[PDB]
Design a protein around this ligand. Sequence first.
Ligand code: ATP
Ligand code: ATP
Ligand code: MG
Ligand code: MG
Lengths: 405, 390, 828, 235, 102
Amino acid sequence: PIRALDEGDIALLKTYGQSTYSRQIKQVEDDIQQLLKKINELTGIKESDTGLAPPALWDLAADKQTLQSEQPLQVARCTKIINADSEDPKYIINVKQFAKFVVDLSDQVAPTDIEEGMRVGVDRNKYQIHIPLPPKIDPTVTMMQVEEKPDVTYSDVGGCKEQIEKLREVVETPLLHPERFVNLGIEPPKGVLLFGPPGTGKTLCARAVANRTDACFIRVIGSELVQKYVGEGARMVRELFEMARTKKACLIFFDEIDAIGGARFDDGAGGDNEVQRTMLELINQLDGFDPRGNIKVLMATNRPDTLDPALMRPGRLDRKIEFSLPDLEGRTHIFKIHARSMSVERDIRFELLARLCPNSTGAEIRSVCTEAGMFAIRARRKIATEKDFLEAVNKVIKSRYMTYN
Amino acid sequence: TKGPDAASKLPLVTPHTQCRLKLLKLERIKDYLLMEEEFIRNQEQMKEERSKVDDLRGTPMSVGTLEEIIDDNHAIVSTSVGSEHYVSILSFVDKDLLEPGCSVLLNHKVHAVIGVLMDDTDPLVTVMKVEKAPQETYADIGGLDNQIQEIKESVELPLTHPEYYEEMGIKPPKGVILYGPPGTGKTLLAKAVANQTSATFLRVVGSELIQKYLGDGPKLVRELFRVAEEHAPSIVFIDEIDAIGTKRYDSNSGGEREIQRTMLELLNQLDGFDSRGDVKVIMATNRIETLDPALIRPGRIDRKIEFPLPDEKTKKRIFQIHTSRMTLADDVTLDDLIMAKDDLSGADIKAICTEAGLMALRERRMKVTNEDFKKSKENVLYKTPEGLYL
Amino acid sequence: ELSEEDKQLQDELEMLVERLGEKDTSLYRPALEELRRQIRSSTTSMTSVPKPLKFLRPHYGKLKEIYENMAPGENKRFAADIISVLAMTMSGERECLKYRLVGSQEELASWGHEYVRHLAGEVAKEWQELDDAEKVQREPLLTLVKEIVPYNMAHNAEHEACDLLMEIEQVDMLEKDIDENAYAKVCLYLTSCVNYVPEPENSALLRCALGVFRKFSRFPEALRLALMLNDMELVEDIFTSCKDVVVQKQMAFMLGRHGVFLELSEDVEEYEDLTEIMSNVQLNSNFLALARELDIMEPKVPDDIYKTHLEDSARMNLASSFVNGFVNAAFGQDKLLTDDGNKWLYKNKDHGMLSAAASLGMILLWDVDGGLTQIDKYLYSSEDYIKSGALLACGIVNSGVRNECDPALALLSDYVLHNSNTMRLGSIFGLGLAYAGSNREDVLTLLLPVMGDSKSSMEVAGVTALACGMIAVGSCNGDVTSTILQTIMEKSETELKDTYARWLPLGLGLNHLGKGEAIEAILAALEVVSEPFRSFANTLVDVCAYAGSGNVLKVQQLLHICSEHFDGAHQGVAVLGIALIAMGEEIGAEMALRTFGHLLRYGEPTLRRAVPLALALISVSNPRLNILDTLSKFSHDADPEVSYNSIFAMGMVGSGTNNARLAAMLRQLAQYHAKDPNNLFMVRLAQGLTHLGKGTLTLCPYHSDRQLMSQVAVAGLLTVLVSFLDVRNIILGKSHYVLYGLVAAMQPRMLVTFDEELRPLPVSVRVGQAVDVVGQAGKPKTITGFQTHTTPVLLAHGERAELATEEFLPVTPILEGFVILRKNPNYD
Amino acid sequence: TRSEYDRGVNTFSPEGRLFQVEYAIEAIKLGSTAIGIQTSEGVCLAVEKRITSPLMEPSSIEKIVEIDAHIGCAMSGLIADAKTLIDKARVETQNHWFTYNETMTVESVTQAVSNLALQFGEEDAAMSRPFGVALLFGGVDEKGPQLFHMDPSGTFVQCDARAIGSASEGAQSSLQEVYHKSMTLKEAIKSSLIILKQVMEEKLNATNIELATVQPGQNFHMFTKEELEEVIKDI
Amino acid sequence: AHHTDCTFIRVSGSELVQKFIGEGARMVRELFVMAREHAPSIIFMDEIDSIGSSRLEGGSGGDSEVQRTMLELLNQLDGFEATKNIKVIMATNRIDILDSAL
Ligand SMILES: Nc1ncnc2c1ncn2[C@@H]1O[C@H](COP(=O)(O)OP(=O)(O)OP(=O)(O)O)[C@@H](O)[C@H]1O
Ligand SMILES: Nc1ncnc2c1ncn2[C@@H]1O[C@H](COP(=O)(O)OP(=O)(O)OP(=O)(O)O)[C@@H](O)[C@H]1O
Ligand SMILES: [Mg+2]
Ligand SMILES: [Mg+2]
């Protein structure tokens, strides 16, 4: 009992209930769309900045720099000088990803400054050496290091006194005052694992460490250590620890190390043994058949129960520190720190607010202060009041206890 | 500091009805477009050293990863096949702009540094930009006044009036999570933000940052936030984030560990060691309870916005909005559908309107009616024992 | 594939039509009766697929043949009506009325309303395709229109009637069918259509809406429309054709906000009160009350704006004077000049002094007596520049306020024709910006004589042109046009290449602002100038004529001018003109923004410098990220002039907004251009503009509902921007005083309420974006994004205020500026 | 790790802790603060009443109750456990009076209530979890005014001044700062109300507090509205 | 499929379930790109309860990857940039288990 629209039904519904302007509107909209397409087509495509310098800094005749000094020397690592056979050196080279070769020098004005593994330059057709090069630096690991100190001090970390003291001891006192440790005959811990509920001042304490320390600080991107090409992650961690050893006093800061390696149980993880392998290399570097030098490690993690026991062992992570939820004094101090810069009344009870926010983290308290300011803004008021802070607490901490009176 | 990318969008013709005023407005848009087209045509119709410099530049220029720049005219580059060469740098290159890892350009044959190509953004992350702007303004969102206010305070006020916050030393929220049942405006309130924002909008779906190989998901997340930080202000909208971000349990498989690694990379980008620019994140979720606390943390997600099923007045707003463009008859009182205390999302209400229109068309009538709306309500909605309480 | 009943109806119609075919000529009438009955029963029903219409589709031609072949008589037309109702569905040669005219002429509603809509559209279409002849063929169409307009009135289709009448080109009959329950939804629709149609239809619609408003005694709306039409006789009629005094007070407020001033005889009930309101003698007091009610009367020195403490030779000090004037504008109080005094009006290194003194005038803005006092302290100086600046300061002080005495006239006339081109050059400009909207003959009789004399440079002549144009904006004052044309015709190719000669064509255009077509004469009496100064004059006068007209043809001509390659300044004028013709309708403005971007990319330097000025003009005191981002990415340009213009445009677009993400741009830009004084000056000036009046004044030349274009504001904006058309010489040098032309534009951005006694009534209002939900071709706009305040209050761009409570009824349905509120009798 | 050691009240953790007793002590905090002060002139109790909304007449929130004519109890924690322990205290005081024909001392009644509270899972007492309520018994006996504090673990101890409830940590510090032995009862009342006003999110006025006092003389007296307003006038 | 003149695409069963990580989502994206290219398109999806059913808590006993595939399909059906002319015919044998999002 439901007819189907015929030719006439459709030819009348498109022509009977109809505005006398509908056709013109439709045509004009289609024209606008087509014109937009055509305009985008004509002016489309910008000029992708290619890196050209401003004119008058260039130097033509560089076609001669391209025809002379032409040799686009490949880089090779002399892995064996074949004993030099006294005369007739007959060096060996290890052009990576390409081949091994037996070659000689060519116009090498210092045939003695060749060594083994010196990263020589080698021509394309005849593989004679032309010029040595300095050792590889691995730009990824090179930029892993922190250069600009973050603007966080040991005064914006409120509610963490014992943890700050332990971290300061382990990470700074062996660096700035070795006299006490050598006097007492105690080798201070070399390795700290900061663990606690998400958001308690772990990375904030790491930032404060980075700001205070006068020593190499290496923030390790947990994603940069995982790659394709099995063995690449292990190679990167090896080179990272090599550079750390090169530096006089180094402070590595593996953040969210739960990414790089938990338990080693593979079972169905046959495809995830590469991460376990790089974690094993990290373990070896942290403590193995070799002194580690003046390298101190920081390791931040919310969940230090998925981690490998071989990594959590107190020969690699020696001073495990827990960032617990701050007590009432800590919460009051965090409120004071975070509301120092806020435009607030002069009689707000931050002790009361710390009481109102139990089992709350420093990030939670920061959010409370921000929402108090936001409530003040949402009323055209310049000074956030105790009422606004209480509203912010109610909105952030919680979002009936009539049995607990 | 390349600058906002924005999203070009034409004006909006206020009268939705088919009348001469709408025709005049559309004709004005069209005539301006025609003048622009003819102006471009006339520019190109009325229109040496750099040409020869480009001729000297290689014809099929290759792209290689610079590594350990040396001297002032010689650097080591990579061929993107693992091999690396001790190449020279022509004077054409900028210099003082090459950095290790930068995807420099190399002459095809002689292999000399001749360009820098500082636009090596991956296609996977260039596609996820917003160049159009969906035509879903805030006037298409019935109700949700509090949710709209929250998101405006988070991603609009900090760009339109950046004096309120500096006037009290407060940093506005950098992260919002829109959580709620299946269909309540969670995606409309990102579409409206994209429509009304001057910032670079970046659509993403949590099921898209996951990649096949090892270490590629984290790399994609890092690249996404790198581009989102180069373009500023920018908003990154991760729809259905519970694709990646679910609770971080102790994995036994390898793919699960890689997915959690991607999630940790996202966490570090949201709130990590170093810093975060003016990139604001909006995640969307159906089931928030299953998300990891470290992700829902109120340093990465300052605001959490629930989108509950609409109440009566909001439902009336939805019906008004979705029947506005409909030739509603005078026999229809959109109150019987409102009052029924049944779970009705805005999506359900729109489906009800569409099905009522289809019922009218089936009955051969172009004007909907109350019986049509009743039938549509009955036939659209698909989905405690009696007397157990009371 | 049909139904049994459907097939039976098909068969019935077939039998009836076949009988019509048979040449009985005896039973035609019953068959035609039956066909008509079925057709009207189907059409009048709610079915959108009328079955008799569907089934008579094949027989259309047969019905045509039967109509042709039947003998003349009643049956002829009785079947022509059937053919018409059938033709409602199949068309292409547009028959429905072609057979309705030879018809039964019954009520044009029995055939449903779809027939009415089709026939209305077809009447319009026939109307366009009729030449001026065939008038006899045109009366029968007006009968259909008189049958259609009432029917659309009765059926909520007021927009349909308006479309029919404005497309028939006779918007005159609405007055017969409008009712007190329709005037709103018809006037709003006409006004919306006005912006987008060309002349003479623009004025036709405006006068139709004005007549509708006057019918139902909606005087304030009638006056707004009468001001849209720059016609003073109509506004005089409206303002004097009223018997309620309070509404006349409100209309006087409206006239004062606009540049107009009506010379009323000794007849109105309260002539003196009305002339006081219309003269803005209470603007200073109201402004100071608003400032007190917000805690802003605390003068802030330039350093507070520069904010260089956190995060002085000759020119940055001129910037300090300018920013001090801009920030502390109309407040009276200051801390640099006012107080210590004699310190930032000295050490300004000669020529800048002339503007520093003028800064005083802008601090004592709308304050004639305090002006007098402080300025007179400085009006007697050993060096000429101070006296010139003091005279300009008097002019600024009297700007916007129509004092019954003429302090500006006396003081500045003593010094017009003075034996020095510097006292002349401040007194002339002071008179120009003091009596801008005045159009007084006694000031022009003193100014025009000074453009011609051996003792006048191009500077003095150009400033006299500017002054005379500002005095007589949009009045086609014969004396002004004649004198300007004489001055242009009496100078050689050289001596006409000074860039101070831009101001003679600028005076012409200002004197013809908005007049439009009527300008041919002046562009026909001006086709004798040299080539390089005739494209400029022609283009400038043309763009001034179509100021806010939104004429796409003129914009097309300007874009053609831009396309031309001249290795040329008229191109720069044409860019500003594209901005100027399109500052009205909103849809035009965004599209112009796209065009200006294309001009920045596909453009030679000459128009590249001009695009920033266009961006500033299209958005004035309306900071939007689309324009601010554009200008910011161009604030670092290699070309100095494009930079300078981009910085000043950032200042203008954010003028009087205190925008924080513009103040940040300006500070970072101040460090970036620290070592370039010529950019540092301009960034400082942009900062001063951004903090103009410390967030209490707007330079937008559009006030009432964004719909009334103040002639004087456009005059000032054009003076400043055209001067920027040569920044490096006009303003980055000698004539930096021209910036004070902006005085003509700055006008408070506040809502202040009163009772029916000119006494404040703090009342609660909701302030929010000018948004709507559904236009529905006539539905008003309702605020979305409420935020409740208590008046007095400041309204930003795009903000409207609606009385939060019903306790009071506004006289005008526009809550911007000064509003008189009657205490509602109903309740609340 | 506290998932195999805090699921029962008779399971020790590797550190030797009863996490269920810990959790009852934590449940104490969810109640409203109560400050008791012992002085040579008597004992004062002052509690933050926490009216959730009007229409609930104040004499249904029993934070301060009477044990015999010479003891009062200021409570914080679960209302049900509060009622149980208060009833035990009253019945024990009456039993001691019946047997020995004298008034039970505050220490002895606190000891009896604590003896009831010890029996978490002791299979000869029937309660299966610690009473999540902490009490302040302020009374007067032959040893002068005394105040005793009892916690869920059954541990009781005298206190020259104490504060239990939500604002316990932040109010005991104020009590330490302000309390000295040579204090009068009026001074104690004033100081306790000052601390309550400090630690309350609501304003101190008339209702939302209760105040009571037991002196060497008149019986346990709960200040009514008049006395409460008189003290609040110039707290 | 026989009677329509629109491009008919067909998924069915677990054709979008791949052992590699994040491959079902990619296959769904490529599918809908292909449908958009050859629009108007009709995408049949037989036995969708295989690929798309009530979501399980992310843990050791949950198919998080198939859940990700379904989430990608949801986003393709209705997210940003709504589909232009793609119509979807899903087929299931038991509807009570399909995700409320679908
Ligand atoms: N003890 C504290 N003192 C001050 N601010 C704190 C404290 N704890 C947290 N915060 C605030 O929280 C944020 C710091 O969070 P942080 O990066 O330390 O978290 P986290 O513990 O490393 O978390 P996760 O690793 O789970 O992301 C900043 O807003 C900081 O102000
Ligand atoms: N408040 C609302 N106002 C108007 N339309 C609404 C509203 N809520 C939902 N809709 C309608 O729902 C449909 C899309 O809803 P939307 O995309 O916002 O849902 P969602 O919350 O993202 O859902 P999901 O969890 O399934 O992705 C559109 O028809 C939109 O109009
Ligand atoms: Mg962290
Ligand atoms: Mg969604």
